[PDB]
């Protein structure tokens, strides 16, 4: 369908500055997604095959933002991501020709990077399952198998580490399994540092003050804070955003919404 051409993500977006405190982990995963792009020939001169990929899992936090990071920082040619929503669909079996045609597009786009999101859609079969066994065994034969190439990028993002087969099949090809490590008390101020390019921000706002009274407030919830800031700024006809104005939106969106959740 049209998702095969929707796989391309043009119109650049959120850049490197949405790192949620993972100053070292962003290198422990950038080393495979963005490092082999500057000098790919030097890795061939090193003798070793270029790295394959890493594994991000655990808590959701600010997930799916690092792919936008990998879109903005990759200023040469955007990559292809495969969400797990396209795998669990009626009339299974389309994912075989779909992964073969996005691998074909990967070979057509001069070694385009390929991403795989939401493995938990078909993960955890625990053997109606044979039709899933085809898609996941063929998925291993196309990803863990060196058929396309042992190359540039393979990755699985998920909310549950209960994957039986990928956990015992990754160490042959994949490596570097790291936790998500959502930002706590030191990353929300930096998500405010990337939200500094939003509606005009008065210099009276202290990002640490707005980022310390909000527990369990990863990029999505504080993204809704910066959204309701400008939204109530329209509802109040304000010209500049100030935390002392939408503090009711802050403690409302975290407290009045943290009462039942």
């Amino acid at each position: 369908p049209t998702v095969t051409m929707m796989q391309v993500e043009e119109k650049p977006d959120v850049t490197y500055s949405d790192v949620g405190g993972c100053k070292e982990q962003i290198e422990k995963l950038r080393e495979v997604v963005e490092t082999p792009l500057l000098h790919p020939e030097r890795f061939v001169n090193l003798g070793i095959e270029p790295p394959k990929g890493v594994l991000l899992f655990g808590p959701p936090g600010t997930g799916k933002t690092l792919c936008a990071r990998a879109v903005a920082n990759r200023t040469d040619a955007c990559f292809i991501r495969v969400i797990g929503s396209e795998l669990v669909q009626k009339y299974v079996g389309e994912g075989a020709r779909m992964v073969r045609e996005l691998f074909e597009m990967a070979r057509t786009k001069k070694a385009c990077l390929i991403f795989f999101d939401e493995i938990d859609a078909i993960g955890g079969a625990r053997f109606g399952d044979n039709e899933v066994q085809r898609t996941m065994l063929e998925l291993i034969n196309q990803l863990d198998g060196f058929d396309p190439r042992g190359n540039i990028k393979v990755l699985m993002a998920t909310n549950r580490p209960d994957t039986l087969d990928p956990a015992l099949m990754r160490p042959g090809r994949l490596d570097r399994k790291i936790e998500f490590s959502l930002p706590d008390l030191e990353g929300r101020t930096h998500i405010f540092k990337i939200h500094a390019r939003s509606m005009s921000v008065e210099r009276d706002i202290r990002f640490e003050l707005l980022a310390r009274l909000c527990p369990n407030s990863t990029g999505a919830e504080i993204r809704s804070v910066c959204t309701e800031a400008g939204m109530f700024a329209i509802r109040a006809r304000r010209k500049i955003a100030t935390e002392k104005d939408f503090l009711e939106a802050v403690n409302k969106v975290i407290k009045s919404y943290a009462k039942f959740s």
Binding site: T35, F43, L46, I48, N130
Partner: protein, 238 residues
């Protein structure tokens, strides 16, 4: 430990192109080799180190793959694997975890084996009544030999019982020497200190050490891998 890689390279290479001597001395091609023992040796990694020496048509096949949800898949995979194997030229295919499905138990508390061992005994029918079986060889390996079918004692079936006597770190530096002889490494490698540092490690763990040495070599300043990056990888991942 070179007699278990040389005995295997022989046991899988000589039944391939020695048919002339097989008809000069009346010798049958060896078929059954049991590459059992504890982990760490890397029976799949070493079977890949020998399959790379053969470079024949390799098809994936595991032990518990017979365990499915519906009926009819086991005969499709057995008769499919021996349909392509029976149709094409003699090649090499390695399987693993054969004991996970070929284990009988007096206690009926929990076990399958109905169609897993009925289909597996259909495979043992294709190795039981098919004398033209001089075609593609199926190498089998188990993780434990506590329970074994007594009917598997034959020259065509599993006879070469290769045990893993806790291979020394020098053997891990030999399979790791083969798994590291391709990179551009500075020719100062005694293999003795980095072998001694690789204790209680697996083959894929040693390849993870070598890859880890291949990770920071860009940011180390030198384009040629050094000697301290191997132990840096050892202390890094494990």
């Amino acid at each position: 430990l070179d007699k278990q890689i040389q005995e295997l390279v022989e046991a899988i290479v000589l039944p391939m192109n020695h048919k002339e001597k097989f008809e000069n001395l009346g010798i049958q091609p060896p078929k059954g080799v049991l590459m059992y023992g504890p982990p760490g040796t890397g029976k799949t990694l070493l079977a890949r180190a020998c399959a790379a020496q053969t470079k024949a048509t390799f098809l994936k096949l595991a032990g518990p793959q017979l365990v499915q949800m519906f009926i009819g898949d086991g005969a499709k995979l057995v008769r499919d694997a021996f349909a392509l194997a029976k149709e094409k030229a003699p090649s090499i295919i390695f399987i693993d975890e054969l004991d996970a499905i070929g284990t009988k138990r007096f206690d009926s508390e929990k076990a399958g084996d109905r169609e897993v061992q009925r289909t597996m005994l259909e495979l043992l029918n294709q190795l039981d009544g098919f004398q033209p079986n001089t075609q593609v060889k199926v190498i089998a390996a188990t993780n434990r030999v506590d329970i074994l079918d007594p009917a598997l004692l034959r020259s065509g079936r599993l006879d070469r019982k290769i045990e893993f006597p806790m291979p020394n770190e020098e053997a891990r530096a030999r399979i790791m020497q083969i798994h590291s002889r391709k990179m551009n490494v500075s020719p100062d490698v005694n293999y003795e200190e980095l072998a001694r540092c690789t204790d209680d490690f697996n083959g894929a763990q040693c390849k993870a050490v070598c890859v880890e040495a291949g990770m920071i070599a860009l940011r180390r300043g030198a384009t040629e891998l050094t000697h301290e990056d191997y132990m840096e990888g050892i202390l890094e991942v494990q």
